[PDB]
Design an enzyme around this catalytic site. Structure first.
Site, short mmCIF file in Angstrom:
data_model
loop_
_atom_site.label_atom_id
_atom_site.label_comp_id
_atom_site.label_asym_id
_atom_site.label_seq_id
_atom_site.Cartn_x
_atom_site.Cartn_y
_atom_site.Cartn_z
N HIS A 1 0.81 -1.22 0.00
CA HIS A 1 0.00 0.00 0.00
C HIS A 1 0.86 1.29 0.00
O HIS A 1 0.30 2.38 -0.09
CB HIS A 1 -1.06 0.01 1.11
CG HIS A 1 -0.55 0.21 2.49
ND1 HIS A 1 -0.51 -0.83 3.41
CD2 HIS A 1 -0.14 1.35 3.11
CE1 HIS A 1 -0.05 -0.30 4.53
NE2 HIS A 1 0.19 1.00 4.40
N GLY B 1 2.16 5.80 9.96
CA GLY B 1 3.59 5.76 9.63
C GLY B 1 4.30 4.51 10.13
O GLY B 1 5.42 4.20 9.70
N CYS C 1 3.44 1.43 9.51
CA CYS C 1 3.36 0.33 8.55
C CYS C 1 4.75 -0.10 8.06
O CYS C 1 5.63 0.74 7.87
CB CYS C 1 2.45 0.68 7.38
SG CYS C 1 0.76 1.11 7.88
O1 OKW Z 1 -4.31 1.34 8.67
C1 OKW Z 1 -3.47 2.10 8.20
C2 OKW Z 1 -3.51 2.56 6.76
C3 OKW Z 1 -4.24 1.54 5.90
C4 OKW Z 1 -5.56 1.74 5.54
C5 OKW Z 1 -6.27 0.75 4.87
C6 OKW Z 1 -5.65 -0.45 4.54
C7 OKW Z 1 -4.32 -0.61 4.86
CL1 OKW Z 1 -3.48 -2.04 4.31
C8 OKW Z 1 -3.61 0.35 5.55
N1 OKW Z 1 -2.45 2.61 8.93
C9 OKW Z 1 -2.28 2.42 10.31
C10 OKW Z 1 -1.63 1.31 10.86
N2 OKW Z 1 -1.45 1.14 12.17
C11 OKW Z 1 -1.92 2.10 12.98
C12 OKW Z 1 -2.58 3.23 12.56
C13 OKW Z 1 -2.77 3.39 11.19
C14 OKW Z 1 -3.57 4.63 10.89
C15 OKW Z 1 -3.59 5.38 12.22
C16 OKW Z 1 -3.19 4.38 13.32
#
Ligand code: OKW
Ligand code: OKW
EC number: 3.4.19.12
Lengths: 304, 304
Positions: free
Chosen positions: B41, B143, B145
């Site tokens: 992504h 951030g 990820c």
């Molecule tokens: O979830 C996502 C972005 C995302 C959206 C949809 C699909 C996928 Cl693969 C990834 N990032 C994230 C990861 N861990 C934690 C936190 C976030 C956002 C804020 C907290």
């Protein structure tokens, strides 16, 4: 989101860990620049640990008696000195992996990460607090002595703790990197009173703010309190008295959540008086006091 | 003595972390040998995250669009391929800090350490379990990820998890290092059911053995049970059914304490039926399931 008992990345400290052997005793040492720091009881046998005269024991030892090994290679000891309860072994080689570092004496209630080590090799890392009674509730086995506690600000490692001893109560005692014990403890095999511990009130409050930030809000109530009213409750429950300095440090979390510090104190008061009623907060069924307000802000902001 | 939620020393993984940027999106990558692994992504903008056609999005990208930075130096991307939900960026330089490593797919109920990272820089390390529903209860911000989960056996790092997403429920989902999501999750901004979670029974039992080893014995009773009787209780309390494979893995702890596995199950049964009555076990007021029998033996033996 999510809230964990997060430790600092341990790499900078792993590169400093060495094994120090003297006679029959082996423990961990901390190699920074051209000096190896380790607990002075490395010079003792079990027999003289009952009442050691460290000055007399160290006199029978020469530089060649301190075997210092960094991984698989041996360090040459060119000097030795005792500073309080630590030995400082001057070696002929500066540690190439020495990070930017400081030696700091943390205050009770502050937190730090511990890199538990055996034979100069790291086994694990965990976060813990210096208890108000100056003990730490670590996880340490025989051979762990010389393992260190630390904090990291950007690229600087602030070493605050060196593990020395386990009390008969199963709690842990150690020194700052100048060899000064935290608390009344002495490096002797003698029963020693840790003293009454208390719950670190400012940390519980910071963790309640962390809970609100991460979605757990069930404990928020329609009440408020005063510092004096709250402190009567804190005294009853062996909680440290809250001061305006603590309220000031909770400012950022109060602003982040829009919940005034004294309103959060009233939530804490009700949790102390009524318990959790079988509910949880951030996966815990008790009030957690091992996160400082700084830790909550750091974990919720992503400081690297 | 002492029992902590201990993570593996993170140094070997810190040396692999890089920052990967593509277009406007920046996340973490894992640099092993001459390949950088990161969540696919990274090629998406927020607009196409609703329903991304990763194959079509990757086609608009060339090697020069993937900016990979290791600390302060830039890596030259000479190849790119998508394997399931991860991108593999071939770089012209092998990571000098690559440890001995393996890519392993952990089983639900197994534990691992997570090195949370932002902009290729590490911020903290914590231990966690792969839940029976294949989510993890981590601590991750925007951030994070590309941050990875791992285990260490002597000098070998077994990478098991790569962080990808946070569900609306605040729990975390990710993949193995081949890009295969653990669980039913897809890398899309769509509400996704995590499914019923359960308590990892074998881990709670291992932690009860850890409690006995470290002195907490109040919960030991005069009772015993059978696997069938215990499993009726486990079903009622959303605990995973205990099997003979679980009893076999608890063998070392049963031998260490002299407490037969089914006797420990009877203690667990009584704790499930009666609660803790305001008491604690290893500083916890609930039954902890994030320590495997292997973890308990390791922490109580000092494996480095
Ligand atoms: O979830 C996502 C972005 C995302 C959206 C949809 C699909 C996928 Cl693969 C990834 N990032 C994230 C990861 N861990 C934690 C936190 C976030 C956002 C804020 C907290
Ligand atoms: O306590 C000691 C040895 C010792 C005795 C008396 C005084 C001093 Cl300074 C040191 N070592 C230790 C440390 N952490 C943990 C565990 C141990 C033993 C087993 C568990």
């Amino acid at each position: 989101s999510g809230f964990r008992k997060m430790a600092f990345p341990s790499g900078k400290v792993e590169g400093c860990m060495v094994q120090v052997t003297c006679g029959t005793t082996t423990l961990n040492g901390l190699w920074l620049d051209d000096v190896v720091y380790c607990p002075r009881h490395v010079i003792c046998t079990s027999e003289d640990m009952l009442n050691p005269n460290y000055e007399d024991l160290l006199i029978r030892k020469s530089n060649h008696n301190f075997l210092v090994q960094a991984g698989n290679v041996q360090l040459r000891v060119i000097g030795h000195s005792m500073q309080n309860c630590v030995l400082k072994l001057k070696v002929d080689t500066a540690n190439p992996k020495t990070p930017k570092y400081k030696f700091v004496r943390i205050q009770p209630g502050q937190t730090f990460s511990v890199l538990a080590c055996y034979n100069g090799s790291p086994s694990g890392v965990y976060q813990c607090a210096m208890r108000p009674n100056f003990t730490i509730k670590g996880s340490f086995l025989n051979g762990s002595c010389g393992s260190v506690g630390f904090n990291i600000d950007y690229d600087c490692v602030s070493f605050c703790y060196m593990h020395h001893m386990e009390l008969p109560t199963g709690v842990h005692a150690g020194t700052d990197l100048e060899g000064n014990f935290y608390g009344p403890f002495v490096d002797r095999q003698t029963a020693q009173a840790a003293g009454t511990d208390t719950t670190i009130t400012v940390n519980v409050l910071a963790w309640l703010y962390a809970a609100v930030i991460n979605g757990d809000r069930w404990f928020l109530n329609r009440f408020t309190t005063t510092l004096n009213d709250f402190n009567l409750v804190a005294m009853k429950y062996n909680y440290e008295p809250l001061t305006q300095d603590h309220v000031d440090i909770l400012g950022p979390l109060s602003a982040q959540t829009g919940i005034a510090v004294l309103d959060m104190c009233a939530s804490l008061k009700e949790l102390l008086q009524n318990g959790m009623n079988g509910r949880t907060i951030l996966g815990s069924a008790l009030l957690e006091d091992e996160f400082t307000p700084f830790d909550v802000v750091r974990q919720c902001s992503g400081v690297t």
